[PDB]
From TrEMBL, chain B:
Classification of source organism: Bacteria, Bacillati, Cyanobacteriota, Cyanophyceae, Nostocales
UniProt source species: Nostoc sp. (strain PCC 7120 / SAG 25.82 / UTEX 2576)
Name this polypeptide is given: Alr1529 protein
Length: 199, 202
């Protein structure tokens, strides 16, 4: 089969940090290809994207890739950057994050089969509050996803130490892991029933 | 320490890397090569299957503007035109005059904002359209002229990807159009060795 997949999200969807230039998204597509699927891989991750940034752009971008392509899938992963602190406040408030996510997922599912994947871990010396804010936000994402019958993958627990994810990020730029980290992410997705449902 | 760069590749299936089971295309491969040569690349693939120069003209500015910035090392690379020349109901999807107009508009706007490179169409042999190769070469020559008029570097991969390159062999053995890892690796090698790619900032 010939599925077209759009991956929409932030740096972690882009695979920022991976010298192999695949991210997790490229790797799960390579693996679907080995299983005899014939995947068209559309990565639409953008560095620094919040839910607000995604809400503004996703439809006009995704629609051009999936126009009259009746075998298609859209995978969203965002939220990390919403909670980044600027001038002591989140880039996007939690109310806005929820609003944004509902709006994005509600419209998306009317057009395409949709999946959502949680924020992945990020440790930041100056912001010891980030982990807690991220987990609280993730639970809000899961509630939205539950209301909308959108499968939600929580990758956070399985990418925390002892995973290489946070170690590779710390050695790199503090934020983005490399090939080993993205490989671990891809394997979580490859084991997700909602993903396996397609492949 | 590594030189950071963000690169948007804008075009059609051949930019997407359609057919490459490794999910890199030539674009991912040249980025991997840059990473080995001292860069730290943010790789933005913005290829779309079936895209013509008109599709590109309409979307490129808003998509690239979200991914590149004057504040950091940025590069946009365009490669398109094959789909313009596809015959639908007996005529090109996009007329040669329109391809030229679109290309001038795209490149003129782009070069004002970011470092830019253009790469020619790549070979496609289509049994029901014997005319395709000549139309493609004629189109490529017009793209080259626009690029020369605008001081935009143009890479002509076309003659280098015809036989004995594996490009067309892999394409025929697959879906008639899209090559696989071998062919995209050949394409990457040409780009990697291009002076303008090496000197993208010039």
């Amino acid at each position: 089969t010939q599925i077209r997949i759009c991956f929409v999200g932030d740096s972690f969807v882009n695979g920022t940090g991976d010298p192999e230039c695949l991210g997790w998204t490229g790797r799960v597509c390579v693996n679907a290809n080995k299983k005899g699927y014939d995947v068209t891989y559309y990565n639409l991750g953008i560095r620094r994207d919040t839910s607000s940034d995604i809400a503004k752009r996703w439809l006009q971008e995704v629609s051009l890739r999936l126009h009259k392509e009746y075998n298609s899938l859209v995978v969203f992963s965002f939220g990390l950057n919403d909670t980044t602190l600027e001038n002591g406040k989140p880039r996007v408030s939690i109310a806005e994050t929820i609003k944004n996510t509902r709006e994005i997922l509600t419209q998306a599912k009317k057009l395409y089969p949709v999946l959502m994947i949680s924020p992945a871990p990020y440790i930041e010396q100056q912001d010891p509050g980030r982990r807690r804010r991220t987990i609280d936000l993730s639970q809000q994402l899961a509630l939205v996803c539950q209301d909308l019958d959108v499968p939600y993958l929580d990758v956070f627990p399985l990418l925390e130490k002892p995973s290489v994810w946070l170690h590779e990020a710390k050695a790199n730029d503090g934020v983005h892991p490399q090939a080993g980290g993205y490989t671990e992410f891809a394997r979580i997705v490859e084991n997700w029933d909602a993903w396996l449902n397609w492949f």
